[PDB]
Design a binder for this molecule. Structure first.
Ligand SMILES: NC(=O)C1=CN([C@@H]2O[C@H](COP(=O)(O)OP(=O)(O)OC[C@H]3O[C@@H](n4cnc5c(N)ncnc54)[C@H](OP(=O)(O)O)[C@@H]3O)[C@@H](O)[C@H]2O)C=CC1
Ligand SMILES: NC(=O)C1=CN([C@@H]2O[C@H](COP(=O)(O)OP(=O)(O)OC[C@H]3O[C@@H](n4cnc5c(N)ncnc54)[C@H](OP(=O)(O)O)[C@@H]3O)[C@@H](O)[C@H]2O)C=CC1
Ligand SMILES: CC(=O)N(O)CCCP(=O)(O)O
Ligand SMILES: CC(=O)N(O)CCCP(=O)(O)O
Ligand SMILES: [Mn+2]
Ligand SMILES: [Mn+2]
Lengths: 378, 378
């Protein structure tokens, strides 16, 4: 049938690519809602006109005033758009932990949650898991989409290791001393993927990979000591599963988010011609190397937060959101992003308790941001 | 849950490795029959003692007399053993088209056929397919084991291409002029796999990969136009499947036939600890390059034979068996192996007809061998 899709974050990197997939596949998909922040009204107005969709949410009030005739506006506009729109799939391509309430609202409607917004799962943790039925959350994140495909390759007790690939970012091979002089311009240029600013920055600092290690544990229920990271500079292999017999199954394609987007929207069905395939008629090489954990401890820190569990993963992410914003603002140097995450985590023992309510997560995040902000100031 | 296994070709490369997998997994597998040619009686003696199996076929009558206590001897001994032994799995690791009657007898028993002996399927073609039920033939050949695993990644209508990897053999990158000087000793040394003499020679000439393209078509029912080959010198990726959305799924492991052997015996269940997994703690690379079909046309010749169909694939393989033997005997140069195959195939029009009975295949093989022998002697 023709699936009704709500696109949250429609004007961003993932959102724009998702609308193209939808526009190219009108027999399979239909847009029934759009949500954005209000920073790119030209784009949103174009989207309204091209899709015919008037069911729109805009977060910024001043932005919502300028356009007018907007059904949903303000801080919970995205969430209310989800609560009040009949849909089969909600694509959550918001950025940051602010995607948490839309995620919980999406899961309550019973629709499929095509999840690009990894932070909402990392922050919500068990709370999000408790809200979802088996297979209701379908990963858009390239590594997790790859893992889901590779896991068709055996039964649960046959899985030995999940192996996440990391590009290494623009600072692969750099020394700790080199990192001291990193600028936002340098951090904002990713070697293999074109993305929004936050995922781009997080990929450079390796916090993205740490978030993805937590995401893997949550989505697939595999222990942290069986989740590995390998640096693969081409970003063609998107991740791999190693089975108990010694076999590894890997998923590969030229880097293009339209592929995992299309798969998440029409899960479990594949979408013909979503993206280009690898060309095995032209010479190529796929390289692997260990992550330099001394220079890039963000993944080890994510493991520590994940093993502590409960609200600790929301702490990890919230400390990053504050510190990363501080770096972009020129308030701290690049190494201090992960420096501050570590300091906040080291003082966060009280948050190693399972959240009962959304308010427990929000409290954890509030504490974390305040702590990170104090570190930025002093 | 203890599976009864007959091992045909027990004393050879695959056979030996299979007996090791079985010895390591007594709770899963039991040997109930062995067949061999009679050329390695020391090995056969060891195997009889270690398995406690006296249900043994030996092709050479004088050899059977020398070892003693052999119930089946002669050229029909392997077939007889299969017809007269209760088994759950017949592992056919005979070499050459002489595995055909055992293959057919195995299928008639209803047992799973764990097929290493690709030549029996290549030669039998539709005759073998008619004798098999769906899922009855389970591949041992490493590429086809890999493809079977990767095909879990989608539904049949979602498959765009099956991609077979080829090591390129010892003469990877060599010119046509270089091939003229090849000795049997050079051809007998493979860069990535340790195997019996025939598969070793066939891998050097690229006839092995030709046979494997035909085997792929027959096993998986995928048209020749959707079966591709790429050269991968590491032999770590064992084959891949490209799906209609642009996703590729690949299976990889350090080269060790115990992995596909173990999976074939236990299909669909994986066998814990069968082989070592890829280690991503040390830097490495996986390389791909095209095959130069000007120098190595064996794969294109196999496709041509397969497309012609009927007994043409038996002709391709029989011409190879005869020409390969002539090369090993010093009667022809190395490039003449594939040269003779091409000459026989392009004159083989009378054999582009489906075999009604095994005798039709046997007649096609006789014709091809005689044709090849006249090419050698001329
Ligand atoms: N881009 C990629 O390739 C990948 C991204 N991801 C994840 O997907 C998510 C989206 O990333 P990406 O597309 O790069 O991000 P972008 O920055 O490109 O887009 C973010 C979107 O969210 C909207 N937005 C921002 N703030 C708010 C708010 N307060 N309320 C409602 N909407 C808001 C923006 O609207 P506007 O700008 O118009 O205000 C924009 O549409 C992230 O969680 C990211 O980590 C994961 C895998 C790869
Ligand atoms: N080796 C490998 O890794 C791979 C092999 N294959 C395929 O598997 C099959 C076996 O290959 P491999 O193990 O290398 O071959 P080998 O030459 O190592 O072994 C051949 C086996 O067949 C027996 N044999 C030979 N002639 C006869 C006969 N007339 N009657 C009965 N038995 C006979 C031999 O017995 P004896 O020597 O005691 O007389 C031996 O047990 C081949 O079809 C090959 O192409 C496929 C994938 C990889
Ligand atoms: C494409 C994707 O899903 N990402 O999260 C970006 C990955 C870039 P890196 O591997 O973290 O450098
Ligand atoms: C291991 C295996 O299954 N083979 O068939 C040998 C492959 C060697 P090549 O790729 O044909 O050179
Ligand atoms: Mn990712
Ligand atoms: Mn093979």
């Amino acid at each position: 049938g023709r699936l009704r899709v709500v696109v949250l974050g429609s004007t961003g990197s993932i959102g724009t690519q998702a609308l193209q997939v939808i526009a190219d596949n009108p027999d399979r998909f239909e847009v029934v809602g759009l949500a954005a922040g209000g920073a790119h009204l030209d784009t949103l107005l174009r989207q309204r006109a091209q899709t015919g969709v008037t069911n729109i949410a805009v977060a910024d009030e001043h932005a919502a005033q300028r356009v007018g005739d907007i059904p949903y506006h303000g801080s919970d506009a995205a969430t209310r758009l989800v609560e009040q729109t009949e849909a089969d799939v909600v694509l959550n391509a918001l950025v940051g932990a602010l995607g948490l309430r839309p995620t919980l609202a999406a899961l309550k409607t019973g629709a499929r949650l095509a999840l690009a917004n990894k932070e909402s799962l990392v922050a919500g943790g068990s709370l999000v898991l408790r809200a979802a039925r088996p297979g209701q959350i379908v990963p858009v994140d390239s590594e997790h989409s790859a893992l889901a495909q590779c896991l068709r390759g055996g039964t649960p007790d046959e899985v030995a290791k999940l192996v996440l690939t990391a590009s290494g970012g623009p600072f692969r091979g750099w020394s700790a001393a080199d990192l001291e002089h990193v600028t936002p311009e340098q951090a904002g240029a990713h070697p293999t993927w074109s993305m929004g600013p936050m995922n781009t920055l997080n990929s450079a600092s390796l916090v993205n990979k740490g978030l993805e290690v937590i995401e893997t544990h949550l989505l697939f229920g595999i222990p942290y000591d069986r989740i590995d990271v390998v640096v693969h500079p081409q970003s063609i292999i998107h991740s791999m599963v190693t089975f108990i017999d010694g076999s590894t199954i890997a998923q590969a394609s030229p880097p293009d988010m339209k592929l995992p987007i299309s798969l998440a929207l029409g899960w479990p069905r594949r979408v013909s011609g979503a993206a280009a395939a690898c060309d095995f008629h032209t010479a190529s090489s796929w390289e692997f190397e260990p992550l330099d954990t001394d220079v890039f401890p963000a993944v080890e820190l994510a493991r520590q937060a994940g093993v502590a569990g409960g609200c600790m993963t929301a702490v990890y992410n919230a400390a990053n959101e504050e510190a990363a914003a501080a770096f972009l603002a020129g308030r701290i140097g690049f190494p201090a992003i992960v420096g501050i995450i570590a300091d906040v985590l080291h003082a966060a023992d009280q948050w190693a308790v399972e959240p009962a309510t959304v308010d427990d997560v929000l409290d954890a995040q509030r504490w974390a941001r305040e702590r990170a902000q104090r570190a930025v100031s002093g």
